[PDB]
Design an enzyme around this catalytic site. Structure first.
Site, PDB file in Angstrom:
ATOM      1  N   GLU A 211       1.895   4.354   2.898  1.00 23.05           N
ATOM      2  CA  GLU A 211       2.889   2.934   4.380  1.00 23.05           C
ATOM      3  C   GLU A 211       4.788   3.287   4.527  1.00 23.05           C
ATOM      4  O   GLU A 211       4.609   1.869   4.329  1.00 23.05           O
ATOM      5  CB  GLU A 211       1.635   1.891   4.291  1.00 23.05           C
TER       6      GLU A 211
ATOM      7  N   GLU B 151       1.652  -4.673  11.074  1.00 22.84           N
ATOM      8  CA  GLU B 151       0.823  -3.748  10.934  1.00 22.84           C
ATOM      9  C   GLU B 151       1.593  -2.857  12.116  1.00 22.84           C
ATOM     10  O   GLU B 151       1.614  -2.801  13.084  1.00 22.84           O
ATOM     11  CB  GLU B 151      -0.673  -3.192  11.453  1.00 22.84           C
TER      12      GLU B 151
ATOM     13  N   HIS C 234       1.153  -1.362  -0.027  1.00 20.42           N
ATOM     14  CA  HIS C 234       0.092  -0.113   0.121  1.00 20.42           C
ATOM     15  C   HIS C 234       1.298   0.975   0.269  1.00 20.42           C
ATOM     16  O   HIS C 234       1.092   1.595   1.140  1.00 20.42           O
ATOM     17  CB  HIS C 234      -0.914  -0.060   1.069  1.00 20.42           C
TER      18      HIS C 234
ATOM     19  N   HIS D  87       2.941  -3.789   6.647  1.00 18.40           N
ATOM     20  CA  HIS D  87       2.031  -2.823   6.615  1.00 18.40           C
ATOM     21  C   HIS D  87       1.770  -2.110   7.175  1.00 18.40           C
ATOM     22  O   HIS D  87       2.677  -1.908   8.660  1.00 18.40           O
ATOM     23  CB  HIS D  87       0.566  -3.578   5.593  1.00 18.40           C
TER      24      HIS D  87
HETATM   25  C1  LIG Z   1      -4.085   1.510   9.085  1.00 21.43           C
HETATM   26  C2  LIG Z   1      -4.229   0.154   7.918  1.00 21.43           C
HETATM   27  C3  LIG Z   1      -5.042  -1.529   9.433  1.00 21.43           C
HETATM   28  C4  LIG Z   1      -5.120  -0.238   6.848  1.00 21.43           C
HETATM   29  N1  LIG Z   1      -5.926  -0.453   7.097  1.00 21.43           N
HETATM   30  S1  LIG Z   1      -6.684   1.022   5.580  1.00 21.43           S
HETATM   31  O1  LIG Z   1      -5.990   1.858   4.810  1.00 21.43           O
HETATM   32  O2  LIG Z   1      -6.907   2.273   7.025  1.00 21.43           O
HETATM   33  C5  LIG Z   1      -8.324   0.249   4.555  1.00 21.43           C
HETATM   34  C6  LIG Z   1      -9.035   1.482   3.876  1.00 21.43           C
HETATM   35  C7  LIG Z   1      -9.856   0.803   3.414  1.00 21.43           C
HETATM   36  C8  LIG Z   1     -11.123   0.752   4.313  1.00 21.43           C
HETATM   37  C9  LIG Z   1     -11.921   1.729   4.185  1.00 21.43           C
HETATM   38  C10 LIG Z   1     -12.926   1.905   5.136  1.00 21.43           C
HETATM   39  C11 LIG Z   1     -13.241  -0.099   5.771  1.00 21.43           C
HETATM   40  C12 LIG Z   1     -12.713  -1.652   5.303  1.00 21.43           C
HETATM   41  C13 LIG Z   1     -11.571  -0.366   4.102  1.00 21.43           C
HETATM   42  P1  LIG Z   1      -4.486  -1.910   6.031  1.00 21.43           P
HETATM   43  O3  LIG Z   1      -2.899  -2.329   6.491  1.00 21.43           O
HETATM   44  O4  LIG Z   1      -4.108  -1.192   4.588  1.00 21.43           O
HETATM   45  C14 LIG Z   1      -5.049  -3.339   6.361  1.00 21.43           C
HETATM   46  C15 LIG Z   1      -5.386  -4.125   5.531  1.00 21.43           C
HETATM   47  C16 LIG Z   1      -6.080  -3.768   4.203  1.00 21.43           C
HETATM   48  O5  LIG Z   1      -6.666  -3.345   4.695  1.00 21.43           O
HETATM   49  O6  LIG Z   1      -5.574  -4.756   3.045  1.00 21.43           O
HETATM   50  C17 LIG Z   1      -6.113  -5.726   6.364  1.00 21.43           C
HETATM   51  C18 LIG Z   1      -7.413  -5.796   6.298  1.00 21.43           C
HETATM   52  C19 LIG Z   1      -7.480  -7.418   7.507  1.00 21.43           C
HETATM   53  C20 LIG Z   1      -6.423  -7.866   7.259  1.00 21.43           C
HETATM   54  C21 LIG Z   1      -4.971  -8.239   6.845  1.00 21.43           C
HETATM   55  C22 LIG Z   1      -4.894  -8.900   6.390  1.00 21.43           C
HETATM   56  N2  LIG Z   1      -5.032  -9.449   5.064  1.00 21.43           N
HETATM   57  C23 LIG Z   1      -4.950  -6.850   6.553  1.00 21.43           C
HETATM   58 ZN   LIG Z   2      -1.827  -1.866   4.293  1.00 24.05          ZN
END
Ligand SMILES: CC(C)[C@H](NS(=O)(=O)CCCc1ccccc1)P(=O)(O)C[C@H](C(=O)O)c1cccc(CN)c1
Ligand SMILES: [Zn+2]
Length: 304
Positions: A67, A266, A64, A192
């Site tokens: 990040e 994270e 991403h 991430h």
């Molecule tokens: C701050 C961090 C936690 C990141 N989250 S984010 O940038 O706020 C996601 C933005 C999009 C979104 C916005 C609102 C609701 C759902 C998704 P991420 O690294 O991008 C989280 C990541 C993803 O959404 O791809 C994630 C989430 C759940 C599980 C996993 C493990 N595969 C990885």
């Molecule tokens: Zn991410």
């Protein structure tokens, strides 16, 4: 020039991949595993003391774009490895026994965009038929419960899952590489930020992994180890319940490929600075993360 305690632009990271390899040919080889939508080279560093048929751990950063601490960590890791080999007993053993495949930046096109235009860009920079909206979310783009939950089918959205699994050249390249090396890759680590968590499968479904008990014990110990350095507190658990459901993630896909140790990190922080983590926190963040990555590596080597 390049600095390990600053965020570096792609041109600088690319030059660094060439330089750090040429300076350490007995511990690093560099290859390209593909090109991005915009024709940038997706470099992979094989870090380790070369030898016949070694096991491996695969780690990527920069899925991403915004990040930035993720990209910084992969660079920090490589220097740690090369500087301490031969002197620190654990890292010396690690690099003798296994290889780390380190992919410093997967989503290069997006990363460049965060430097040139929009610091908060997330997705790739590929075009989409029928619309002016740009980019796919690479972490919704893998063939794991693809686009069934936590993903959008709209190209204008931040969680767009793509026209199809592995539609993006970048995710195709990563998946192609891992499928080509399944016999050697024993763990998959994807970096991430932010939130200070260690996540394991599943995220595309609420079902638990066969070795859920082992993975929880491992994550628990890793977060404990991480905290010893500066007191930084992580939470941990299955992706779906620990943060939210998100189908098409690379860690879930890797795991269903047979890679039993699959983790999403994270890094810092918890929201004070969010994605815009100060450069003054790069060293501390990377140092404590190293302890968790090395703890996991030490465990994996004992379970081949
Ligand atoms: C701050 C961090 C936690 C990141 N989250 S984010 O940038 O706020 C996601 C933005 C999009 C979104 C916005 C609102 C609701 C759902 C998704 P991420 O690294 O991008 C989280 C990541 C993803 O959404 O791809 C994630 C989430 C759940 C599980 C996993 C493990 N595969 C990885
Ligand atoms: Zn991410």
């Amino acid at each position: 020039g390049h600095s390990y305690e600053k965020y570096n632009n792609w041109e600088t990271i690319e030059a660094w991949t060439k330089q750090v390899t040429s300076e350490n040919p007995d511990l690093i080889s560099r290859t390209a595993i593909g090109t991005t939508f915009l024709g940038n080279n997706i470099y992979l560093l094989k870090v380790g003391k070369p030898g016949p048929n070694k096991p491996a751990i695969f780690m990527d950063c920069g899925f991403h774009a915004r990040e930035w601490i993720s990209h910084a960590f992969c660079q920090w890791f490589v220097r740690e490895a090369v500087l301490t080999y031969g002197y620190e007993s654990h890292m010396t053993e690690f690099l003798n026994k296994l290889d780390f495949y380190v992919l410093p930046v997967l989503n290069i096109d997006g990363y460049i965009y965060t430097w040139t235009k929009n610091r908060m860009w997330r997705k790739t920079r590929s075009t989409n038929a029928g619309t002016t909206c740009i980019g796919t979310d690479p972490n919704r783009n893998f063939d794991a419960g693809w686009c069934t939950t936590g993903a959008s089918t709209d190209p204008c959205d931040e969680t767009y899952c793509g026209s199809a699994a592995e539609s993006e050249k970048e995710t195709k390249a990563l998946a192609d590489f891992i499928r080509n090396n399944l016999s050697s890759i024993k763990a998959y680590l994807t970096i991430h930020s932010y939130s200070q968590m260690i996540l394991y499968p599943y995220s595309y479904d609420y079902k638990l992994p066969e070795n859920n008990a082992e993975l929880n014990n491992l994550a628990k110990a890793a977060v404990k180890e991480l905290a010893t350095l500066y007191g930084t507190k992580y939470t941990y658990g299955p992706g779906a319940t620990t943060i939210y459901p998100a189908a098409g993630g690379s860690d879930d896909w890797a795991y269903d490929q047979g890679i039993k140790y699959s983790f999403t990190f994270e890094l810092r922080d918890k929201g004070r600075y969010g994605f815009i983590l100060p450069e003054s926190q790069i060293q501390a963040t990377c140092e404590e993360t190293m302890l968790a990555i090395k703890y996991v590596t030490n465990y994996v080597l004992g379970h081949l």
